[PDB]
Design a protein around this ligand. Sequence first.
Ligand SMILES: Nc1ncnc2c1ncn2[C@@H]1O[C@H](CSCC[C@H](N)C(=O)O)[C@@H](O)[C@H]1O
Ligand SMILES: [Zn+2]
Ligand SMILES: [Zn+2]
Ligand SMILES: [Zn+2]
Length: 428
Amino acid sequence: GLGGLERFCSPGKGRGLRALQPFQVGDLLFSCPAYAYVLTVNERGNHCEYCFTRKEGLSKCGRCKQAFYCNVECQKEDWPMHKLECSPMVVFGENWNPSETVRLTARILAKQKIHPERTPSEKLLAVKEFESHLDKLDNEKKDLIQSDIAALHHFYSKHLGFPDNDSLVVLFAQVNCNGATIEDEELSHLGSAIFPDVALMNHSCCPNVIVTYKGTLAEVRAVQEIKPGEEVFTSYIDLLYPTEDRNDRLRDSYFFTCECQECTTKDKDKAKVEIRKLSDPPKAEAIRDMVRYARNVIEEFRRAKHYKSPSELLEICELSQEKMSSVFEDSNVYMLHMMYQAMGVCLYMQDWEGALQYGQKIIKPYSKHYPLYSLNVASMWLKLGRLYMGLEHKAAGEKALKKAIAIMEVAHGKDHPYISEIKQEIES
Ligand SMILES: Nc1ncnc2c1ncn2[C@@H]1O[C@H](CSCC[C@H](N)C(=O)O)[C@@H](O)[C@H]1O
Ligand SMILES: [Zn+2]
Ligand SMILES: [Zn+2]
Ligand SMILES: [Zn+2]
């Protein structure tokens, strides 16, 4: 398996990963090549399909004209997977729209068909041993999975010999509980992948490691000191939100309730739900009313941004901030949430000054709500630094970039290509 590590049975968590030797903050616990992976549609042309390297002047697949490569070698290496989509993409035309989960599952089945034996990605845990939580799925969940299976048959029937329906349901549930989004240095979505050895790690809201990505390779580095015998815990979710929100998401997606220190004590929750200390104290029921409102408007915005204009979205953020502010301080995570969304739609609108203005009032609370080494914090420092540099505020830009580097050296490793790029952006 992996030196200095050991698969074991973690009480109340099923199987987990334990350390057999000490690891210091920044040490590399291990690296894991992707078992199967797929680049998200919106990043085609920016990244190489095979190795995920970002560069300009990628070779275009002459066949489908929708898959870009470093060279003919990367193209050849990606052909066993790319042929699943090359011709269907041109035949279906505009009707080709499988969800990313379907694309990934199709590549999983292909990888099992050609490489049925244990891969180097499965040193400690094989794909077939994945947890499915089949018995927990309600009818709504089952019907969503059945819709994905229907799409799988619809777009990938010519190249894959499919197992029976039951097995496909198990596979999709396993993907939903073990899949891994790949994000860039600004936590922008690059694609989805299966990292069997990485999936073994259980969740904690105070994790001791962070998973970063070097192309299609997952790397796992410590963000706290790990001693022999201690279990290795990563985070599955955004840690910004209070305990009940986190466990709502964990129950919904992974079907378990977390009992880590943050969940048991809920101490940071008080900072996260900051109430204005005004002459008139809000009553508890008014607080809970505004909290419910906040959680509702967050979901409403997730929906609205698919069919609404950017300015309409900014209006939603501005109006919700005013209403919520009557009760919530600006450091409240629901205010920060709407500020972050406003920053994103301003970034899309290319209003760099506006987005910078929002980002400035986001990093101060962000830094304290998130753990010491957090990719969310690093990415915010990086976005800020790049806006500063773009608007020629070099002094403040360099400051922000160094803060990002300080966290990334730990999480990504000091020799990571991203850090080289950022140091170039300081010297240029
Ligand atoms: N902190 C935690 N408490 C209880 N169960 C957890 C947990 N973190 C992860 N899990 C379990 O692990 C699943 C994710 S895959 C992680 C490995 C899994 N424990 C296994 O034996 O294969 C979750 O769906 C949940 O069932
Ligand atoms: Zn490449
Ligand atoms: Zn093609
Ligand atoms: Zn927790």
